[PDB]
Amino acid sequence: CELALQNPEVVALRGGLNTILKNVIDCQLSRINEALITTILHLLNHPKTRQYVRADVELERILAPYTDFHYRHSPDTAEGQLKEDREARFLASKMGIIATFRSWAGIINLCKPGNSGIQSLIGVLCIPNMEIRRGLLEVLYDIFRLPLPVVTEEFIEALLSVDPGRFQDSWRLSDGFVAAEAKTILPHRARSRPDLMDNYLALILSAFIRNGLLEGLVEVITNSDDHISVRATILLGELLHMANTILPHSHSHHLHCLPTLMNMAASFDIPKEKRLRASAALNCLKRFHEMKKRGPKPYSLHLDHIIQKAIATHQKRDQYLRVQKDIFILKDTEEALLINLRDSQVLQHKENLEWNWNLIGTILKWPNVNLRNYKDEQL
Amino acid sequence: WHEMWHEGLEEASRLYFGERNVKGMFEVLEPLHAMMERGPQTLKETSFNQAYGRDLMEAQEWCRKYMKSGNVKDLTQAWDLYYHVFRR
Numbered sequence: 001c002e003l004a005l006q007n008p009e010v011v012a013l014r015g016g017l018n019t020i021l022k023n024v025i026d027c028q029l030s031r032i033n034e035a036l037i038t039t040i041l042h043l044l045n046h047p048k049t050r051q052y053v054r055a056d057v058e059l060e061r062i063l064a065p066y067t068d069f070h071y072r073h074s075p076d077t078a079e080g081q082l083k084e085d086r087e088a089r090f091l092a093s094k095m096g097i098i099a100t101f102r103s104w105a106g107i108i109n110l111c112k113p114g115n116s117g118i119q120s121l122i123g124v125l126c127i128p129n130m131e132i133r134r135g136l137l138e139v140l141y142d143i144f145r146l147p148l149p150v151v152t153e154e155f156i157e158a159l160l161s162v163d164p165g166r167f168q169d170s171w172r173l174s175d176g177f178v179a180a181e182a183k184t185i186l187p188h189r190a191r192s193r194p195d196l197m198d199n200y201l202a203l204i205l206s207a208f209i210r211n212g213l214l215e216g217l218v219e220v221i222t223n224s225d226d227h228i229s230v231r232a233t234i235l236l237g238e239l240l241h242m243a244n245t246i247l248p249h250s251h252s253h254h255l256h257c258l259p260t261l262m263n264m265a266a267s268f269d270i271p272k273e274k275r276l277r278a279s280a281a282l283n284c285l286k287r288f289h290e291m292k293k294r295g296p297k298p299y300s301l302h303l304d305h306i307i308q309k310a311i312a313t314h315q316k317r318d319q320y321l322r323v324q325k326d327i328f329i330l331k332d333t334e335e336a337l338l339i340n341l342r343d344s345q346v347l348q349h350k351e352n353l354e355w356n357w358n359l360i361g362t363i364l365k366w367p368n369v370n371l372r373n374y375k376d377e378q379l
Numbered sequence: 380w381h382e383m384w385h386e387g388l389e390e391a392s393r394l395y396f397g398e399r400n401v402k403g404m405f406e407v408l409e410p411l412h413a414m415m416e417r418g419p420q421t422l423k424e425t426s427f428n429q430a431y432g433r434d435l436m437e438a439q440e441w442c443r444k445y446m447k448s449g450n451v452k453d454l455t456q457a458w459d460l461y462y463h464v465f466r467r
Contacts, residue, residue, distance in 0.1 A: 219433070226429050233426045275422075 009239035010036040011051060015057045030068050036074035038363050044079040052083045053222045056091045063098055066110055075096075077120035084121065085128045085222035100139035102148055111152060115159055122163035126170065133163070133170045144178045147185065157182050161194055167201050168210045180220045184227055184246050191249045196256050197222075203259050221260055224250055225269050229276045232283045245287040255293045309336070315347040380427055387411050388465050392458075404441075412439065433467075434460045 013032040022029050055072070063069040076083075099114035118136070121129050143156040169176060179198050183191040193375040198308075205214035228243035228250070254261055263268060275288065287296035300312035310333045317325050335356075341353035361378070367373045381423035391407045394400040415435060419428045436462055 223429070230426070230429055233422065234430065 003043045005194070007046050007051055009250060010039060011054060014054060017060060018058055026065060026068065029062075030065075030071060031134045032076075033068060033071050037071055037078075039145055040075050041078050044081070048149075049083060049086065052079065052088065053090065056083075056094075059091065060094050066105065066107065068354050069098065070109035070113045071119055077116055077374065080120055080124060082341070084124065084132070089133045092132055095132075096136040096139050100142060103143070103146075103152060103156075109153075115156065118159060122165070126166050130170055135172055137171050141178055142176055144182050147182065150226055154182075154186070154207070158190075158194075159266070162196060164201070166204075167214070168205065168208065172213055173216065176214075176217050176220055180224055184242065186245075187249045188245050191245065195249050195253045199253055199257060199260060203257070218260070218265055221265060222268075225272065229283065231273055232276070233279065236280070236282050238267070238282075243286070244289070247286050251289050251293050255281070308338075309333075328375065328378050331375075335379055380424075381431075384411070385466070388461055392461070431464060434464070 014038060017029040017032065024100050025054070026241070044047065055075070059069060059072055062072050073095075095114070095117060099109065099118070102110040102114055121132055121267075136177045140156070140160045141151045143150075143160070143317075147153040161179075164170060166173065176198075179194070183194055183198075186194075202214045202217055205211065224246060228246040231237065231239075231243065273287070277287055278284075291298050291314075297313075300316050309328065313329050313332060314326070319325065338352060339356050342350070342356055345352060359379075362377050363373070387408070389406050394407065395404050415432075419425050419432075438457045441454060441457040444450070
């Protein structure tokens, strides 16, 4: 009764806005579009899917202002029951082009409507939105490819990761290639959640039947370990803050679950860190982030001095009850003095250096039977 | 290794862009394609593997997408990779 007369009035208003130019009737067309969006939010059951097709056909001409399309995109996110699942190609070549050109136009109303449409497409379903995800892959990659000169490019990169919750067979062409690029340029708290989400998605893909679509990301887990450690192998460069942010995110990803490094990637990551620590003094400073995960006391001494290192190790405790801790610190200081004597005995008396290098014989057998490595962590 | 790719790109680009080369460009590139079968052995050869050895074998597939018709979009990604590694 009333809905059949309200849908025909909205269709007549859309036809009058399409027949208009509309230079001087832009505000009236925007008010009519807002009234039609309010009538669609009040009732979205009359009379068929032809009104949604007419609104999708009229949405390409309403993006001229482009403030008139921001109110029409809100109506498509509220009446999206089965229109996106039936006719997805009618707006895939327009919504992605409006979302990709929103960064070049510099409109907040066009940027909020594309994000709202992406959220409404991600919250409804994921298997039926494969064509909309494939059509909007360029708009999702342009935010990660142009984040240097744009300030709003880092906002869409965080929202595109929430849409790929499953990420089984959505795109599989540029999903893992752009996920490791934004994490190496963002902050620590901004890349700690994304690397953990990518590791959880890789573990969910390995646990499911789609194990072949995530088995080739180990090199993607290697370059993030190579941008701070193996980056100074050929030429030394800094990028010191970027290396410190890449080492902390990698340490958080290794201490979160550790289901990817064990056991074919942790032995290659420990050998690369050992080769970087034995190469020069610039690449050997990344071990403190390796020490801050389980035995964290790297800020005790700022490389000054050898006599103050024992005082820093003694002040590293609380120290309310440090009876055994004082003897452990004295044993660690004596071991450091023996290592200093072995370093000063270069290079005709290197038996003590070989004794310090082979000092993990009984410690490897004691930790495999009793699981007690307090003295090894102190050394 | 990385010294010869400079003139290897500077010849193979500028012949195709200026002097209308079709089959001689593959003749210029084929000593460079007949080099990476020995494999890395040392630390510098491993640094070349972790620094550039991901797109050199793959770009030949783009050449395999060029030999059937001669499209533009099936080759300009290889030009993007070449122009990216040239500055690096």
